Amino acid sequence: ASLSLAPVNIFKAGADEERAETARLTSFIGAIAIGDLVKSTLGPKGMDKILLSSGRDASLMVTNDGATILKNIGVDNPAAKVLVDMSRVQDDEVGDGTTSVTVLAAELLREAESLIAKKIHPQTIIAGWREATKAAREALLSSAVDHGSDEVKFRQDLMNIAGTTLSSKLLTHHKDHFTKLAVEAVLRLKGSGNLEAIHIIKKLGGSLADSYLDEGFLLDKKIGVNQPKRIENAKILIANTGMDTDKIKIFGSRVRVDSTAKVAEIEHAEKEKMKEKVERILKHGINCFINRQLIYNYPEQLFGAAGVMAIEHADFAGVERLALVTGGEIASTFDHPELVKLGSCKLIEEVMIGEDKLIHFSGVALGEACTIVLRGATQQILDEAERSLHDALCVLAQTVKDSRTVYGGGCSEMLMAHAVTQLANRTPGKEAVAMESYAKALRMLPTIIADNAGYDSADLVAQLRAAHSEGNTTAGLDMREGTIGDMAILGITESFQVKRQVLLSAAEAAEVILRVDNIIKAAPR
Amino acid sequence: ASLSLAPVNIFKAGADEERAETARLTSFIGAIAIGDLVKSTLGPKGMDKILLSSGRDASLMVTNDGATILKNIGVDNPAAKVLVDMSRVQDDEVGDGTTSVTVLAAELLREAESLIAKKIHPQTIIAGWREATKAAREALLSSAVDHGSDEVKFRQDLMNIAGTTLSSKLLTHHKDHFTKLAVEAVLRLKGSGNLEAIHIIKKLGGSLADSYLDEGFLLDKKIGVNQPKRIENAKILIANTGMDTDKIKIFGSRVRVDSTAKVAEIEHAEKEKMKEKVERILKHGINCFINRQLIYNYPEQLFGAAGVMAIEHADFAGVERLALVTGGEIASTFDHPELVKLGSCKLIEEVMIGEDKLIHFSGVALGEACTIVLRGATQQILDEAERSLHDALCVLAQTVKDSRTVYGGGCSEMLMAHAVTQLANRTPGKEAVAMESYAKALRMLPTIIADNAGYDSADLVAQLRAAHSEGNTTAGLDMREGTIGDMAILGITESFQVKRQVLLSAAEAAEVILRVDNIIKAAPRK
Amino acid sequence: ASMGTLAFDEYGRPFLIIKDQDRKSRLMGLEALKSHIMAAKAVANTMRTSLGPNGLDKMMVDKDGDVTVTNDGATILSMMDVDHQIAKLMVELSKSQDDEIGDGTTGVVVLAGALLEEAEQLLDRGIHPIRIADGYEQAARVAIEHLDKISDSVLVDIKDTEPLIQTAKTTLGSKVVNSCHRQMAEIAVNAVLTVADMERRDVDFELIKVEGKVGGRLEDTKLIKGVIVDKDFSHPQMPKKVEDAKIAILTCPFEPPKPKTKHKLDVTSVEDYKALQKYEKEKFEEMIQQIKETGANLAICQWGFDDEANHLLLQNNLPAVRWVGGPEIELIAIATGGRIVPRFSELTAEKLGFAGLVQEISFGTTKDKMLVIEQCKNSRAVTIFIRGGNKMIIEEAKRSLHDALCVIRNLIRDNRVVYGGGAAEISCALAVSQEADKCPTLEQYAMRAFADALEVIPMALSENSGMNPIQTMTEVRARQVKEMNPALGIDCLHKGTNDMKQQHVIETLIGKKQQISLATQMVRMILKIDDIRKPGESEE
Amino acid sequence: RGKGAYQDRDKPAQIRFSNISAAKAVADAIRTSLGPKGMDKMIQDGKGDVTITNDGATILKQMQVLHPAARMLVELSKAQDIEAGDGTTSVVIIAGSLLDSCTK
Ligand SMILES: Nc1ncnc2c1ncn2[C@@H]1O[C@H](COP(=O)(O)OP(=O)(O)O)[C@@H](O)[C@H]1O
Ligand SMILES: Nc1ncnc2c1ncn2[C@@H]1O[C@H](COP(=O)(O)OP(=O)(O)O)[C@@H](O)[C@H]1O
Ligand SMILES: Nc1ncnc2c1ncn2[C@@H]1O[C@H](COP(=O)(O)OP(=O)(O)O)[C@@H](O)[C@H]1O
Ligand SMILES: Nc1ncnc2c1ncn2[C@@H]1O[C@H](COP(=O)(O)OP(=O)(O)O)[C@@H](O)[C@H]1O
């Protein structure tokens, strides 16, 4: 029975239950709504999107990646919340394919709606989809190719993959140069899998071509007054002390005086203690000093008299990457000047770019940190460029970890679709119908990928289907003229692990969402 | 340059026209609504539908045929009006298949909006649908069969076709008796298409199995007071004479007298003229008189003195059919007894069924009429019975006019499916995709056909596909077992002409609907 | 029995009976019982769809906006906006069945639903609830006797778990995790047998936590015989991997403890200030030397440490973590065999737990790592790590492993088991029909009511999948007449055979008898209650 | 073998349940006046017309109801009265009970 047509509604105010078909209608309609809201960023012609803040903040951002929309969007449909959860999972896994897995899930749900309207049970659909996913995964691994051993081929595949990632973004104008720059940046880590080490800056104005890579480090903390402005070839030490009005941590201590003479004596004692601490710091043999918290007037005056620069407002990430790139060691007790390693740098300077004073590091010792200069007229294009660069770094790291790759741009999509169609016509029953709907969603993904360019779909899809039937498993759609051809020679390749992860995530999300039959609601607040 | 975002517009009070894509959305959702309201009445497991007008009148209809269902319904989508029009055209052409063509058009528009979502243009859709309709018509022509030359084969085909037609109706229990009755009535008409020659009574009480095609007739008029209650072997006289408050048509004459003696003499004049008129009536040698208008006390008293039956309030259609079947004539001047034709009758009596008195007629001369007694439990089950009988008579008459037949019940449907499937596989382009969606809707019609009983769809589709692959143009579904069978052996037979008309009309209506892009609305009157 | 009572006294004066009677719907008696039974009707019909492997999964959005997609009925209905006390009573019924067995919680609810289904028609016939309850109790005794008669038991002990693996796979088939049923069964049995007591004692579920992180693939779900630590090392250059580590239990911050009562210290002169500074410095020195005296590898701080302590630990190269939750401290102390340490006074190398292996785990570009502890020679805690494509499949895996482990615990408790999937239900229906045929007539209506009530389980199983229910019902009943077997039932997975035993489906007999008894008792109690008070003021 | 037809559409079923509910409302409003041991009906007209009797079909003619099922039950009762003349009250009660059975 259903509570929709019942003598009583056992609910509080605002809580309701709806008929099974209506419940799935609402859930899957919310899911497909979020799906086509994230849609239209597929392919190299993906249109950008503004991430506006409805509140008084009014923070306006633009991005071509749909995951940014997913992380910052209001949630109404519970299935939409499930979709954003799985998409965030995929994004934390790999930096590309998040919008791909989201749109695949949205389609799978909309043809699930259509197929249930076609009088098919959800369990049969789930079984057919599981069979089709197994077939698609086996086909994808059959055509998967790894070329990590060959260093020249590995570098060429890195070129292709970074170009693939940047094609969907607006940076396609300098795609090749930014590609070689990012590949050099990722190889600068000497096989290190971390990505927070690579740091980026923002500078208003200038052409996009002005963007480049800095091998050293870029710093944007001001220098003191009395200390000399520029001293090179110094030793840099990182400290975790407050370095401001240092007082006894004992809570119960208090001062009880009968006259101002003892007050002045205590003030002089505090000044002498601060001077002793300053001398203890200077005992380390340091000229460029780095601090986290504030530095007051007396210590900065003492540093200026000592001719030693103190750098404040160095946050945890900044000191982290500075230690990674120079080998400096963080310290909190300065009673052992020789027991803490000091940072080694070749050249330090305070460059003047734009209308700001930026400290630039050159000749870093360890080199385990990359600093990238990005130039843009507006902050929006700047953040879009940095997000695209970060996604490129993520996909490059994923390729470095495993070099198993496949031919994308609809090519491997046609492989999967062909395998699933072959199995569907091989098998009888409504499971075949469900998994053929799976296959048609698979085919319609690159359909809209290409149609985002205002091109034709059916002719190219049929041509690629026929060519891959002939055995042209390396044939893929070319965005340059909206035509077909050898996908590899276009220099556009996709990692096999990313494709497999996207396929599995979409399959599992569709399976878990489809099993929902009825929606029950508690009392809203 | 559209109205999606424009600072200024041109509209009247309450007027807001709507763009092409949302025009397609609204028209197609209206078409879907029409199809849904006409569907679920297909196949032997069809389910009846009730009507209830939104006003306080609440017009209530019970019928298994979708044509009457769509006859009485509020219309707001003009495409819905197009659908109602084409269904009514099919109904005026033949009796059966109107719901079939309506649901075909509805599902075609469904697949049309699906293709629109699939990013295709309507013109290519229309071209592909024309090509697919051509191919389907060719395939239907391939397996057409006619057996009208042999009278016994023709009667067997009539038996099968009427049984198939009445299976989708509620009378499936007595299908055999009803089919025999329909065959008897059709062959009693001598092949004439005069539907007005057929009348069926709606009387309350009894069981539907008791229904029979009596050779005579029934009169619902009342016997006079002084008139005899039983006259046998009389002569049927039908008149247009008013003979009530009889006055000259000249309205320019009035009575301006100076004495009541003049008025009394005038009244004596009208009573004498009434006596002369009664004498003129009686001199024709009559015993049963039929009149359209009312009868006063003096004429009935004189007739009772004269021993002549009088029948009043018999409408023009009934008396005309009585003259056609018997031999009487309608008259207005009684100075020509020899120039007025009279019929021949054998049995006129009264029958009491339940608690109502009916004047029973029997012994026809020509027999060019069909009257069937119906023992309906309620008024609505009666209405369903007459609707089903009329549909059976219409389809039998159409088969008489054109005796070409085919095997349907999904078998022919899968035949068109196979033909369009090969056509799609043998050509490239979006045209092939559009006509494949065409064929998919064609196959989706048997989905409703079989799901009116809760049977499997895909398994039977594949089974019939294989059967037609071996060439079995007779392999169709059977509601008894849900398997394949020989429609010729199983008796499920359909008229070739009716099916071809249904297919062509559905294709034409779909083409007409797809050619409209924008719908503009003026200021609403409400 | 609506909007109060209309009397207006009897000489024309205004009349008052009950407070707020202008709109009070006064509910006592047979109509009140109708209201309660129909509310239970709604609850049961909304809940029953989660029965059987083909049974679908309900979702709920709580008052806090958190979704929950679930297959196990107990947790499906455990968070319902219950208003009438009968629904709450059914909730405690489900809870009692769940903590008594763990599986079959759906069975009691559906059985009670069908019992009330025919009870309401029996009430409409004009039958007072007392005789209905007595007949229902007689019927429950008959059903329990049949269940005892058709029992069959096998070996369950720790040495052999192949039947346990089959039972776990059968139980998890109803859950979406049925893709890798063998893998989850094996890992679950390994987890439960990692630490367990076989002398009819409880297994420490405090030490067995089902926790995992999103990401990866479902088949990556693997068992970690150890402890999972969320926190990470504070220093960048600090080493991330330590082997053969020793756990230093610490329950005090790395700062000089302060007096509990309010205190005042008078610092007046330069000498006082310098003396306080050097006292505090020597206190840090004493604390750091005391910490280093034990020589432990890993130090776990509940209250954390400051920057100076962090640098001192860095120079000493002694791995340590900060701000760890108390229950986690208890778990790690039990697993490593550590001892309670209040402060540096009782800090020594002889009270340190041992961790076999400690590692930092990375899941790609997240900047959020975790600490895994395993390989302990005396590990008293074992945890199962589950991977999934999203957090809600993770939750579903959590509850699926929970139910599987509960089934394993029930099997360990006793080997008295039976065959489910409606076959035993059909046998019970046959027994109740026999009792109706062989017992006084007046209560035979309650007899056959209880029979039709027990008949709903195959009803729901069939209509969940989609096969024709009643033809299968009659055919299986006829075959069971031909041969007595609790293994002739519905082939939900469409395996083509009605031999339920051949399909390797095992459920505990204690669970089924408790299900029947609990359902009968709850139905009898609800039959005898006809009082609920409502104000019904229809506030605006 | 296994599953058959999914049977996705369900709303007309519950609409038919509503029709049966109306039919039973009329039926149990009619039921009481059967037999010498029986007691007259319990039905008041919305307009206000009043009749008082023990023969059922008179009450059937009392009601001016909306649902077509009730109207055709009235037709059934009057048809039975026309045909035989006795048991008309029984017919309506049987019809309502059968409708509830169809529900179940
Ligand atoms: N040159 C190309 N030709 C065809 N398809 C491409 C090309 N470059 C990228 N793509 C595809 O477009 C998709 C869009 O990628 P992007 O928007 O960066 O993230 P997501 O993959 O999550 O959508 C990629 O998944 C990729 O498969
Ligand atoms: N025994 C049968 N087996 C299969 N199909 C049938 C059978 N009887 C009728 N049909 C089909 O059901 C359809 C419905 O017929 P009916 O409702 O009488 O008129 P309409 O075709 O206008 O709806 C018919 O077109 C006919 O082809
Ligand atoms: N393979 C199977 N075939 C038929 N019935 C099954 C099968 N597996 C389990 N069942 C039945 O389905 C019922 C529901 O089990 P499940 O949903 O796993 O937990 P719960 O019993 O708590 O609802 C069980 O009582 C069992 O008898
Ligand atoms: N004296 C009697 N004793 C027992 N039953 C009676 C008696 N008289 C009538 N009945 C019962 O009353 C029922 C209905 O009869 P009645 O009310 O006259 O017809 P209706 O219901 O059409 O008005 C019959 O079935 C008959 O068995």
* Three state DSSP letters for B220-266: CCCCCCCCCCCCCCCEEEEECCCCCCCCCCCCCCCCCCCCHHHHHHH
Is residue B125 within 8 Å of B514, Cβ to Cβ?
yes
Say which amino acid occupies C464.
Answer: N
- Distance, in Å, from the CA atom of A33 to the CA atom of A21, rounded to the nearest integer, reads 18
In angstroms, the Cα distances linking A164 to A381, A497, A498 are 20, 15, 13
Check B433 against A459: CB less than 8 A apart: no
Q: What are phi and psi of C496, to 5 degrees?
A: 90, -5
Give the closest-approach CA distance of A381 to chain B in angstroms: 27
Check A116 against D11: CB less than 8 A apart: no
Q: Ligand 3, residues C47, C174, C510: which to mutate, most atoms within 8 A of Cβ? A: C174
- Distance, in Å, from the CA atom of A94 to the CA atom of A101, rounded to the nearest integer, reads 11
- Which residues, 6 or more positions from C464, have their beta carbon under 8 angstroms from its beta carbon? C49, C51, C52, C54, C55, C56, C492
Check D14 against A2: CB less than 8 A apart: yes
- Short-list A405, A393, A398, A367, CA closest to A150: A405
Beta strands at B347-353 and A375-376: parallel, antiparallel or unpaired:
unpaired
Q: What are phi and psi of A98, to 5 degrees?
A: -60, -50
| Residues in chain A within 8 Å Cβ distance of B451 | 119
- Distance, in Å, from the CA atom of C298 to the CA atom of C311, rounded to the nearest integer, reads 16
**Region for A243 from its dihedrals, namely left if φ exceeds 0, alpha if ψ lies in -120 to 50, beta otherwise:** left
Structure tokens of C430?
């046959």
Cα B167 to averaged position of ligand 2 atoms, centre (Å):
7
DSSP state of B515: T
Is residue B290 within 8 Å of B236, Cβ to Cβ?
yes
Beta strands at A516-521 and C57-61: parallel, antiparallel or unpaired:
parallel
Nearest CB neighbour to D8, from listed A5, A119, A430? A119
In angstroms, the Cα distances linking B472 to B98, B127, B414, B422 are 27, 30, 11, 16
- Short-list A232, A222, A191, CA closest to A349: A232
> Taking the alpha carbons of C344, C349, C353, C355 in that order, is the dihedral positive or negative?
positive
Residues near ligand 2 with C-beta < 6 Å?
Answer: B 41-44, 46, 65-66, 96-100, 164-165, 167-169, 408-409, 477, 479, 492, 494
Q: Where are the alpha helices (DSSP H) in A149-196?
A: 151-167, 175-187
- Short-list B272, B278, B282, B271, CA closest to B235: B282
In angstroms, the Cα distances linking B276 to B220, B265, B403 are 30, 16, 58
Q: What is the largest CA-CA distance in chain B?
A: 102
Structure tokens of C353?
């737990």
Say which amino acid occupies B349.
Answer: E
- Short-list A109, A104, A137, CA closest to A416: A137
Residues near ligand 1 with C-beta < 6 Å?
Answer: A 41-44, 46, 64-65, 96-100, 164-165, 167-168, 408-409, 479, 492, 494
Three-state secondary-structure class, residue C254? coil
DSSP-derived secondary structure for C188-253: HHHHHHHS--TTT----TTS--B---SBS-GGG-EEESEEEE----S-SSS-S-EEEEEEEEE-S-
- Which residues, 6 or more positions from C92, have their beta carbon under 8 angstroms from its beta carbon? none
Nearest CB neighbour to A253, from listed C80, C265, C465? C265
- Which residues, 6 or more positions from C456, have their beta carbon under 8 angstroms from its beta carbon? C48, C110, C111, C113, C114, C117
Interface of D with A (CB under 8 A): 3, 5-11, 14, 17-18
- Distance, in Å, from the CA atom of B459 to the CA atom of A434, rounded to the nearest integer, reads 14
Q: How far is CA C63 from the centre of its chain?
A: 20
Is residue C232 within 8 Å of C370, Cβ to Cβ?
yes
Q: Which residue has the tokens 């390729």?
A: A399
- Distance, in Å, from the CA atom of C341 to the CA atom of C45, rounded to the nearest integer, reads 56
In angstroms, the Cα distances linking C374 to B182, B183, C275 are 88, 89, 47
**Region for B68 from its dihedrals, namely left if φ exceeds 0, alpha if ψ lies in -120 to 50, beta otherwise:** alpha
Q: How far is CA C465 from the centre of its chain?
A: 26
- Short-list C410, D101, C81, B35, CA closest to A17: C81
- Distance, in Å, from the CA atom of C512 to the CA atom of C454, rounded to the nearest integer, reads 12
Q: Which residue has the tokens 């059976």?
A: B392
- Distance, in Å, from the CA atom of C411 to the CA atom of C167, rounded to the nearest integer, reads 9
User: For residues C491, C492, C495 and C500, what is the CA-based torsion angle, rounded to 10 degrees?
Assistant: -40
Q: Which residue has the tokens 């056509």?
A: B423
Structure tokens of D74?
């009235």
Check B50 against D68: CB less than 8 A apart: yes
- Distance, in Å, from the CA atom of A492 to the CA atom of A157, rounded to the nearest integer, reads 8
Check C60 against A262: CB less than 8 A apart: no
Instruction: For chain C, give the number of residues.
Output: 540
DSSP-derived secondary structure for B21-80: HHHHHHHHHHHHHHHHHHTT--STT---EE---SSTT----EES-HHHHHHS-----HHH
Check C217 against A504: CB less than 8 A apart: yes
Beta strands at B288-291 and B235-239: parallel, antiparallel or unpaired:
parallel
Q: Where are the alpha helices (DSSP H) in B359-495?
A: 379-401, 411-425, 430-451, 458-469, 487-490
Cα B503 to averaged position of ligand 2 atoms, centre (Å):
15
Is residue C24 within 8 Å of C50, Cβ to Cβ?
no
Instruction: Count Cβ neighbours within 10 Å for each residue of A107-120 and write b for 16 or more, e otherwise.
Output: bbbbbbbebbebbb
DSSP-derived secondary structure for A400-425: HH--EEE-TTTHHHHHHHHHHHHHHH
Quick one: how many helices (H) and strands (E) in chain D?
4, 0
DSSP-derived secondary structure for C457-480: HHHHHHHHHTS-HHHHHHHHHHHH
- Short-list C430, C445, C341, CA closest to C126: C445
B409 carries a ligand binding annotation: yes
| Residues in chain C within 8 Å Cβ distance of D4 | 466-468
In angstroms, the Cα distances linking B66 to B46, B169, C451 are 10, 11, 44
- Distance, in Å, from the CA atom of C386 to the CA atom of C219, rounded to the nearest integer, reads 9
Cα B456 to averaged position of ligand 2 atoms, centre (Å):
18
- Distance, in Å, from the CA atom of C18 to the CA atom of C330, rounded to the nearest integer, reads 57
The span from the first CA to the last CA of chain B, in angstroms, equals 31
Structure tokens of A320?
């982290």
Residues preceding gaps in chain D (C to N > 2.5 Å): none
- Which residues, 6 or more positions from C449, have their beta carbon under 8 angstroms from its beta carbon? C115, C118, C119, C122, C132, C135, C136
Taking CA A273 as the corner, what is the angle to CA A271 and CA A275, rounded to the nearest 5 degrees? Answer: 70
**Quick one: which ligand is closest to B100's CA?**
2
Three-state secondary-structure class, residue A190? coil
Is residue A399 within 8 Å of A449, Cβ to Cβ?
no
For chain B, the chains sharing at least 3 beta-carbon pairs closer than 8 angstroms are A, D
DSSP state of A341: P
Say which amino acid occupies A452.
Answer: N
- Short-list C483, C526, C486, C530, CA closest to C506: C486
Q: Is the CB of C52 under 6 A from ligand 3?
A: yes
Instruction: Count Cβ neighbours within 10 Å for each residue of A19-45 and write b for 16 or more, e otherwise.
Output: bbbebbbbbbebbbebbebbbbbbbbb
Is residue A238 within 8 Å of A343, Cβ to Cβ?
yes
Mutate to test the interface with A, among B32, B39, B116, B119 (most CBs of A within 10 A): B119
- Distance, in Å, from the CA atom of B95 to the CA atom of B162, rounded to the nearest integer, reads 11
- Distance, in Å, from the CA atom of A412 to the CA atom of A141, rounded to the nearest integer, reads 10
**Quick one: which ligand is closest to C47's CA?**
3
- Distance, in Å, from the CA atom of A275 to the CA atom of A298, rounded to the nearest integer, reads 9
Instruction: Count Cβ neighbours within 10 Å for each residue of A176-206 and write b for 16 or more, e otherwise.
Output: eebbebbbebbebbeeeeebebbbbbebeee
Instruction: For chain A, give the number of residues.
Output: 525
Report, in angstroms and rounded to the nearest whole number, the Rg of chain D calculated over CA atoms. 17
Resolution in A: 3.7
> Taking the alpha carbons of B478, B480, B482, B485 in that order, is the dihedral positive or negative?
negative
Is residue B389 within 8 Å of B200, Cβ to Cβ?
yes
In angstroms, the Cα distances linking B8 to A244, B4, B11, B397, C500 are 64, 11, 10, 61, 74
Three-state secondary-structure class, residue C524? helix
Strand partners, B145: B405
Three-state secondary-structure class, residue B506? helix
Structure tokens of B470?
């071996």
Is residue A63 within 8 Å of A384, Cβ to Cβ?
yes
Say which amino acid occupies A88.
Answer: R
Check D3 against C468: CB less than 8 A apart: no
- Short-list A416, A321, A418, CA closest to A361: A321
- Short-list C460, C512, C425, C450, CA closest to C105: C512
DSSP-derived secondary structure for C298-365: EEEESS---HHHHHHHHHHT--EE----HHHHHHHHHHHT-----SGGG--GGG-EEEEEEEEE--SS
Strand partners, B484: B477
Is residue A287 within 8 Å of A307, Cβ to Cβ?
yes
Three-state secondary-structure class, residue C415? coil
Q: Ligand 2, residues B164, B388, B503: which to mutate, most atoms within 8 A of Cβ? A: B164
> Closest residue of D to C494, CA-based?
D2
Is residue A286 within 8 Å of A303, Cβ to Cβ?
no
Say which amino acid occupies A79.
Answer: A
Helix (H) or strand (E) holding D43: none
Nearest CA to ligand 3 atom 6: C421
Report, in angstroms and rounded to the nearest whole number, the Rg of chain A calculated over CA atoms. 30
- Distance, in Å, from the CA atom of B490 to the CA atom of B481, rounded to the nearest integer, reads 12
Is residue A144 within 8 Å of A179, Cβ to Cβ?
no
Q: Is A5 on the interface with D (CB under 8 A)?
A: yes
Q: How many CB atoms lie within 10 A of CB C191?
A: 22
- Short-list A422, A431, A432, A420, CA closest to A503: A420
Nearest CA to ligand 1 atom 14: A42
Is residue D101 within 8 Å of D20, Cβ to Cβ?
no
Is residue A69 within 8 Å of A49, Cβ to Cβ?
yes
Beta strands at C320-321 and C152-153: parallel, antiparallel or unpaired:
unpaired
Structure tokens of A520?
């029950």
